[PDB]
Ligand binder design. Structure first.
Ligand SMILES: NC(=O)c1ccc[n+]([C@@H]2O[C@H](COP(=O)([O-])OP(=O)(O)OC[C@H]3O[C@@H](n4cnc5c(N)ncnc54)[C@H](OP(=O)(O)O)[C@@H]3O)[C@@H](O)[C@H]2O)c1
Ligand SMILES: COc1ccc2cc([C@@H](C)C(=O)O)ccc2c1
Length: 303
């Protein structure tokens, strides 16, 4: 299934997450992105930060060359990293991501984070960063442009700026049953901005940012009980939850079985009572909980 964005392009509602930590060889991203596309994923989420755009791009070009898909069938996202917020650095950074992937355009280019870093924090008017993003859409470098990790206030700042040409099409944010972003999702729906959920399966629990004492989302007893009722798995319940909320959902897996499993989210439905039960789990838990974000002047979870 796809969703129609506010600029008239379409986004597949289930996306493949490609981040793996540096202990995973870079060659894995090539293999698993091919597996994802063979499984039926058509939306692939990457970023300059992930140090994998060469491999993810090759995987996409590999699947086109062999006839499985056409370029126009794939929705490829990359993200502008926080050391490149100054407007003069935006287009060169996007052109670098395109060169690494060996693609002519990205379907989606996002501001990865509102928290600017020296080109150690920076201060940058994100409205000027946005104006540079609009120019990248105009140039045809990106079909669509959006943001990531923005709160309501930061999103309004873009929506209210004088002479705005393009609204962000989405806001890709941490979102799952323990931090379900209900109020932000309502705001996004009011503005025809799609919410894209990352860490929808509870994150990779990487020690750099996630406390290992935090509860493990896929062990949640309500999710396990719904998995048992539907004869599915807790991951599938958590992905289907987002789709029935009107949220576009990413899922990372580097495991061949689980990659193929995750596309089963299209094969069943949760009832109103099941959705109410999952909505009940919300507990303001963001897994990314680190001094490196929390001390930033533009930390999104300040509101
Ligand atoms: N915009 C941002 O700032 C931002 C931040 C974080 C993430 N993201 C994007 O969102 C993507 C997804 O988020 P994420 O990487 O935190 O991971 P996730 O999608 O929350 O996945 C968490 C863990 O779930 C496991 N998993 C996947 N399918 C499963 C299944 N069917 N059953 C049981 N376990 C399963 C995976 O382990 P295996 O690999 O072992 O299957 C994965 O490591 C990222 O890869 C990246 O593309 C963006
Ligand atoms: C709250 O704000 C943020 C900002 C950037 C983030 C970047 C990542 C990277 C590692 C990613 O895209 O995977 C994760 C969490 C993040 C949270």
């Amino acid at each position: 299934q796809c969703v129609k964005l506010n600029d008239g392009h379409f986004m597949p509602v289930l996306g493949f997450g490609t981040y793996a930590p540096p202990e995973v060889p870079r060659s894995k991203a090539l293999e698993v992105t091919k597996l994802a596309i063979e499984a039926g994923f058509r939306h692939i989420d990457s970023a300059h930060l992930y140090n994998n755009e060469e491999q993810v791009g090759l995987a996409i070009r590999s699947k086109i060359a062999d006839g499985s898909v056409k370029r126009e069938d794939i929705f490829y996202t990359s993200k502008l990293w926080s050391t490149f917020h100054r407007p003069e650095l935006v287009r060169p950074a996007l052109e670098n991501s395109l060169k690494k992937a060996q693609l002519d355009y990205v379907d989606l280019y996002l501001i990865h984070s509102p928290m600017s870093l020296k080109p150690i924090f920076d201060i940058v008017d994100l409205c000027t960063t946005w104006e540079a993003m609009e120019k990248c859409k105009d140039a045809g470098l990106a079909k669509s442009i959006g943001v990531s990790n923005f709160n309501r206030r930061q999103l309004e700042m873009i929506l209210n700026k004088p002479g705005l040409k393009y609204k962000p099409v989405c806001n890709q944010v941490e979102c799952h049953p323990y931090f379900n972003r209900s109020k932000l999702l309502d705001f996004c729906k009011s503005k025809d901005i799609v919410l894209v959920a990352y860490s929808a399966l509870g994150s990779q629990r990487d020690k750099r940012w996630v406390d290992p004492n935090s509860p493990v989302l896929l062990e949640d007893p309500v999710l396990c009980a719904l998995a048992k009722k539907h004869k599915r798995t807790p991951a599938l319940i958590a992905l289907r939850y987002q789709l029935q909320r009107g949220v576009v959902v990413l899922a990372k897996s580097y495991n061949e079985q689980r990659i193929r499993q995750n596309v089963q989210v299209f094969e069943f439905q949760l009832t109103a009572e099941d959705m109410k039960a999952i909505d009940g789990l919300d507990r303001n838990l963001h897994y990314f909980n680190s001094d490196s974000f929390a001390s930033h002047p533009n930390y999104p979870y300040s509101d």
